[PDB]
Design a binder for this molecule. Structure first.
Ligand SMILES: Nc1ncnc2c1ncn2[C@@H]1O[C@H](COP(=O)(O)OP(=O)(O)O)[C@@H](O)[C@H]1O
Ligand SMILES: Nc1ncnc2c1ncn2[C@@H]1O[C@H](COP(=O)(O)OP(=O)(O)O)[C@@H](O)[C@H]1O
Ligand SMILES: Nc1ncnc2c1ncn2[C@@H]1O[C@H](COP(=O)(O)OP(=O)(O)O)[C@@H](O)[C@H]1O
Ligand SMILES: [Mg+2]
Ligand SMILES: [Mg+2]
Ligand SMILES: [Mg+2]
Lengths: 256, 50, 415, 259, 255
DNA sequence: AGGGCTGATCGTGCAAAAGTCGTGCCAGCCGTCT
DNA sequence: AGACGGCTGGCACGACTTTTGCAATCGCAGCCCT
């Protein structure tokens, strides 16, 4: 249920959620136009716990950090002892896909070749990178999510027509950081309470309404747990939640 | 046992006139001894007479 | 980066530990046989009657009656030859024709052989020398008075209707023999108590034969397993020859004796270490047994050679040779080590493991289904669904054959 | 020798005649190269030819070029029989070797290795192939299957393809009626996809659609020829999710900001 | 030893030229705007030479892969990585006197040249750590569908690579040049295609088609003639009517 | 006093081939039955 | 009375196991002859 966590009082958070629910039995691709430090992962979770195969695998492997060109070939497979130095393909991602969907983070960097290889997957999905092994398909669904500008990619041609198309089946715009302002107050207090509890801080400092206003002033584009991150900052600013809350920390680089 | 204590082909035949290997298991063979085992198809009293 | 295989990373093998593993995989009975046949040349490698009572053994009991029975020399020879090839069950091992050939008399014919057998067919007991038993139960019933009812129905069935009861085909049996409904079963039951293998009855006695090699006594939970001390082989170093070598004027010959002795000491220590590694492996297995054996074979997880060799530093070949032909007596009793492992499965017990006594007790319940008919594989599947563990009808037929259960439409019997 | 028509749908343009010419080609096993919109009739055309491949023809050896990393792409290319390349063991037969008689399901991926290009040139050389350490050549056989999605002659003038990439390639060309062009089974394949879509939705009754939707459908470019529309169709199905409930609009460009 | 000859004074001239080259086994490379049966050329040469009984079996040079040129020059190694242990010898040695067309030469690589040249100029079989090199005097010749002297201007190859060919590089006429028996040549191409198309027979084409054959740019010289020939065939598939039109630019899209 | 020198050392686990099983599942069948 | 069926097993193919079957070099130095 994602603990129902990350409450978005923006009824658009709900509306997104409703779209999600409609999508929940639905089994086709989806983009989530996410935000910098927003938290598409958590919502994708909230979906997965609700997935039509909610009992299905839920893996988080993004190729954003695909420092290895071969980390790909792996993710596409390996023959048992392909190349060599190895026993078998470490197929965990390929495992989650069958009996699962596809979830990635910041699909921008992909080698275009890697991408269209993913293309030869989505329409059909052979046993891949398998060093000549016969094909095989993973009963794999999909979901997409990023903070990038899709038009910027389209200008970049970053997504091929086959790619941009067959890749995409739904679009989930994360509300802008400041978009869900009532939601901001909401999940903000949500964190406030969650922190005051788990910190075991004997008292909860609460919140200074001035601090609340200053926090609202934070465009805070990053808020994924960047909300939670600045939250921990502010907690330390208080240091201890015994006193009523006023010490709010946003920018921690500052000495003094 | 074999070429040792309580051995067939030694001190006499097996429980029946039947030889130790298994061949000649009947009353038909009076002194016949199998190729698989040589034990006269005979009476067991001579276990105390050989 | 650009992956593949690249050069990096020899000598002479000997079958030393290899022959040792040949011994270990070989059973300790013949393994000690070799151990003796080994230690023989290695010189540094270390009332009469009681009760004395004879018995009949049945066939001689038959001969005892034959002696009192009036018989001729040819008659005695035919009867004795008939007695010679006699089975424990009391059925005739060889046919009448083989007996006629064994008599080797042209005067001896099949009719004379049959007459001799029949005069000796029911002397003691009824149904002796059954000769493809069928007329044996017939003679047994004939011995019974005709005053017993349904004797005629049983007789007609036994005459030429053995096949109908062979498949438990009661409907076809009734359609063929025209036997009475709910009454032909009475003739069937009167036939059922007919002393089959009546000669097998005389044989009843045996002595004990199973060797406790290791002993886990469930000592205060997590059994204190221990091997058999006397069964564990051990040599004694020739300390006399150890002192007969150096002082030997051929200090070379005697010191070489010392060297061969040291090498054999290495061999014996390696065998003892093999025993001790098997023992620590047994410690792991006994940790397993404190639940498995204590929960019995029903609640037993299938293990693998990989699984056990992982807990040890022993090689998979090392263990795979080590336990071959090994059995230990436990609180349950003498149990084979080769029995320890089992194949795993796709059951929805959340895991993969083996059927075993689950399959056995499943056969038990399938039989425990209405004695009218055996429970089909669907019954097993439903029983497993109740068990919450996935089992399949092909898998059910497999596990049943493992328990060696009768077929669903072969074990149907009149209740 | 059977139908296997599958979801080859919406050919009311001369894509029907396109199929006809495809049929005229279908008996011949010579090199196949085509052209058209990615993810759009294209790999469906591939299925089409795979049917044109006798059912008993053989393995529709799919060739997906956007894969292959860099190097031992070479391995399965030329082959790998020796040690030190593909776990050694047996002569690992490459996907190229995997096809013996099979489909050279060449995909026009426009990846960098014209190195590869020359290789495949030798792949299309004399009916032969030779492995890594591949101690002997071996005269090979396979059906040959390419297609396209961009200006091959231009890239030739652009030099971008190996001249011989095309020179060996394309006994003839085979293009596609664009979505800006085909435009004929619009409502037709529209309804076909809609039928599939509701059926999967198990939607109780066909919503129906207003004519404003079809007017937009004519108005729409549909840059992705086959699927982009089809995705749009399923998307209408979803964004509605109502049975018998006549549509009046469709879902394609979610990048369109919400109102 | 036999192929679709160009039947032409330039073609028969290159024929006599190679014939002058026939038993000659000294190194060589090929000149030629394109290839015009580049393989077929070296191939018939292979069928001719004293390497007729020798191994008249080529090897595709610039095919090869990065780390393994050693073995490539010299077959599989005994001591390379642990796995193999047998000094399997040169693909050259797999001929070592046969006819093994050094093709793909143009696309070859830099240090790749650095070795192969020097060895060919001088080097017996010095394999990985071996005892004694053995010179496989293997019938030597390369090729250039491109302009080496241009490459020299670029300087990509060795001037030694320039030395490589011990023979002058014959060239064939451009299609624009050659264009000699293309009537008869196409006729044979068509007999072929009709056999391949299993077609009954060819009534012919337009004489307009003949002129378009004359009015043909013809880059894919040795290919495109028969190529678009049978292409016209199949796009026609029709033998009752002349190939009045032929399959011009498959790259062109019809209206 | 120098050479030869030669056989004097001393090991072992795992792989490669083989087998072999899980698992089920189509064909014939039997029950009987409507 | 004829198709129903449930079963059962052959069938086959992967999945796992699995045994057997290898064969000194680096030195040494002692010897032996010369
Ligand atoms: N609704 C939410 N509930 C709880 N945590 C969230 C939520 N949205 C974002 N986050 C937090 O943001 C951190 C990074 O989140 P996010 O930015 O969603 O991941 P990604 O970087 O993949 O978008 C996560 O560890 C998560 O705790
Ligand atoms: N008749 C149709 N109706 C709806 N969608 C279609 C139809 N034909 C093809 N598509 C869609 O077009 C997409 C791309 O197909 P295709 O162009 O063959 O891929 P490729 O790039 O491999 O050629 C597929 O995902 C498929 O869903
Ligand atoms: N003299 C010839 N006789 C017959 N066929 C030829 C001749 N020259 C070229 N060819 C044909 O040309 C093809 C080889 O093309 P080629 O010129 O080697 O390509 P590239 O120019 O890319 O090297 C062969 O299939 C062969 O049939
Ligand atoms: Mg992120
Ligand atoms: Mg495609
Ligand atoms: Mg070329």
């Amino acid at each position: 249920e994602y603990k129902d966590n990350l409450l978005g009082e923006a009824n658009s958070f709900l509306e997104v959620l409703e779209q999600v629910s409609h999508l929940a039995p639905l089994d086709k691709p989806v983009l989530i136009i996410g935000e910098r430090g927003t938290g598409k992962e958590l919502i994708a979770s909230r979906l997965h716990y609700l997935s039509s195969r909610w009992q299905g695998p839920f893996i988080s492997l993004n190729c954003a950090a695909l420092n290895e060109n071969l980390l790909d070939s792996e993710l596409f497979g390996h023959e048992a002892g392909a190349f060599t130095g190895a026993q078998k393909r470490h197929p965990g991602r390929f495992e989650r896909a069958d009996g699962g969907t596809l979830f990635l983070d910041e699909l921008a960097t992909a080698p275009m070749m890697v991408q269209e290889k993913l293309l030869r997957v989505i329409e059909y999905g052979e046993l891949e990178r398998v060093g000549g092994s016969q094909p095989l398909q993973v009963n794999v669904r999909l979901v997409c999510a990023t903070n990038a500008d899709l038009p910027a990619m389209v200008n970049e041609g970053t997504f091929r027509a086959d790619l941009l198309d067959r890749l995409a089946f739904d679009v989930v715009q994360l509300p802008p950081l400041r978009e869900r302002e009532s939601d901001i107050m909401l999940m903000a207090e949500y964190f406030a309470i969650q922190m005051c509890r788990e910190i075991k801080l004997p008292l909860f400092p609460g919140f200074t309404e001035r601090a609340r206003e200053t926090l609202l002033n934070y465009r805070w584009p990053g808020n994924i747990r960047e909300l939670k991150n600045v939250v921990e900052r502010s907690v330390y600013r208080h240091g201890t939640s015994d006193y009523p809350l006023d010490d709010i920390i946003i920018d921690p680089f500052k000495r003094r | 046992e074999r070429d040792g204590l309580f051995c067939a082909r030694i001190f006499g035949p097996v429980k029946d006139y039947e030889c130790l290997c298994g061949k000649y298991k009947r009353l038909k063979h009076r002194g016949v001894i199998c190729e698989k085992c040589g034990v006269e198809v005979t009476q067991t009293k001579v276990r105390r007479e050989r | 980066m650009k992956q593949g295989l690249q050069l990096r990373l020899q000598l002479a093998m000997t079958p030393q530990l290899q022959q040792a593993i040949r011994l270990l995989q070989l059973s300790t009975l013949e393994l000690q046989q070799e151990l003796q046949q080994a230690l023989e040349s290695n010189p540094l490698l270390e009332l009469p009657v009681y009760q004395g009572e004879t018995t009949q053994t049945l066939q001689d009991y038959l001969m005892w009656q034959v002696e009192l029975t009036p018989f001729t020399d040819t008659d005695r020879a035919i009867a004795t030859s008939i007695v010679d090839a006699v089975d424990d069950t009391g059925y005739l091992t060889i046919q009448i024709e083989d007996i006629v050939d064994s008599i080797g008399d042209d005067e001896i014919g099949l009719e004379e052989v049959e007459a001799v057998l029949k005069r000796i067919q029911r002397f003691d007991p009824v149904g002796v020398a059954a000769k493809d038993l069928r007329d044996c139960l017939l003679i047994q019933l004939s011995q019974f008075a005709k005053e017993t009812p349904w004797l005629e129905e049983a007789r007609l069935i036994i005459s030429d209707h053995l096949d109908l009861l062979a498949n438990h085909d009661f409907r076809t049996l009734m359609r063929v023999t025209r036997l009475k409904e709910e009454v032909l079963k009475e003739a069937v039951n009167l036939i059922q108590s007919l002393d089959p293998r009546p000669g097998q009855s005389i044989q009843t006695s045996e002595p004990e034969y199973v060797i406790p090699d290791v002993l886990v006594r469930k000592v205060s939970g997590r059994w204190t397993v221990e091997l058999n001390a006397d069964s564990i082989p051990r040599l004694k170093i020739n300390q006399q020859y150890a002192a007969m070598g150096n002082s030997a004027r051929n200090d070379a010959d005697g010191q070489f004796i010392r060297s061969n002795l040291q090498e054999a000491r290495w061999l014996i220590k390696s065998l003892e270490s093999r025993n001790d590694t098997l023992l620590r492996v047994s410690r792991c297995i006994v940790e397993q047994q404190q639940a498995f054996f204590e929960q019995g074979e029903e609640y037993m997880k299938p293990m693998v050679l990989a699984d056990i060799a992982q807990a040890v530093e022993m090689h998979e070949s090392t263990i795979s040779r080590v336990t071959t032909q090994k059995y230990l007596h436990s609180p349950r009793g003498i149990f084979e080590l080769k029995y320890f492992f089992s194949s795993h499965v796709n059951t929805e017990g959340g895991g993969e493991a083996s059927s075993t006594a689950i399959r056995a007790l499943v056969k038990k319940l399938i039989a425990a289904e209405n004695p009218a008919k055996p429970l089909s594989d669907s019954k097993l599947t439903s029983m497993l669904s109740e068990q919450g563990i996935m089992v399949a009808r092909r898998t059910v037929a497999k596990y049943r054959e493992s328990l060696s259960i009768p077929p669903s439409n072969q074990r149907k019997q009149l209740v």
